[PDB]
Amino acid sequence: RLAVMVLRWSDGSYLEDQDMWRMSGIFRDVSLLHKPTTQISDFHVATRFNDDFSRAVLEAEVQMCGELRDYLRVTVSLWQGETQVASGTAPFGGEIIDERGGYADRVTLRLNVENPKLWSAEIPNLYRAVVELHTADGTLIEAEACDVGFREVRIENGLLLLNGKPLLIRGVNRHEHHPLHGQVMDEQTMVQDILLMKQNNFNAVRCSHY
């Protein structure tokens, strides 16, 4: 039996003075997750490109918690549909960063990807990255994953560029609101909003203000 005492007001309220309905309660999903003692505690995915985006390097930094051993390994494989385009395996122990050494509980995989399909609101090309925590000899401990969008966002010479091209933001601010359920969001409402936004030529949204 869980017992949750939710307070409407707290010092946290001072930082939540957004122009909207002031409500309270457990308005988002509550779930139970089970992780192995030796687990993936965090992972970052980055994509760098060459001048003409004809080549890319996907770097995945993976962090673990628990029993650190020489047999541990991390394998990051990249998929395009059911086709594995790239894959890298390595043991833990990041590069040396300071006089005390490096992160023995971390590893960074670098995967080369030629002529990658670039992500944008125009064409949302996505790849699937699977992060496997396992023993060198083949035993999977646990796996995590995310959709990877190959795109570069940078500001150059005063212009915001996406994959090297200047963006023209056709955006709108969107609060999480429902006339019946309040600030509780559901998939159907989210999908409806996105379809309506894209149907009306919007390509961007700002999470006002949270």
Added chain:
Amino acid sequence: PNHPLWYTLCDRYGLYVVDEANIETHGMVPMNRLTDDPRWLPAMSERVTRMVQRDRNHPSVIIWSLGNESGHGANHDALYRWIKSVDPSRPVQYEGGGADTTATDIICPMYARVDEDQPFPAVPKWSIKKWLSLPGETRPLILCEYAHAMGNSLGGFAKYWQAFRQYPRLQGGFVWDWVDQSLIKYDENGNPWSAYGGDFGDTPNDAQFCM
């Protein structure tokens, strides 16, 4: 370069002067055919250097000009640098080749409009408000020529000034121009009348475009 007395009078009466080298090759095709030719560098340099050596002590002169309508050639970059080198007390400007080349410290377009762009190939005349904020541009903008006062003209003059006052980097310009270039001729009765292009048998000529 003007008659020497002009600067003395501008010094004493108070007028900011733009001293310009006697260099204009507008009729060439392209406009920079000679200014980009190193063989014409010597003749051009004398027109710039001898000007600076003559007028550099005049306080009314606040800006040096490399000339007018001669496109943009390497000779302009060289002479631009020569002046910056011998006299760092005054900015150097030049409109040829786009009004914003490497040969000018000031974006000095001619007849660039306030809000409307004129996207000419290679040498576009952007609306002055838009010119200022082009990616990477940081220089001030002063039109070397604007509000062409030919005949019944100067319509929209107020639009320029509303912009000059609102935009810090839009610091004005020079109207084109001061006085009609008409010449006096006399009829049979001996009465005087104002004449222009072609009234002297001159041809080809561009008629009233001198007024």
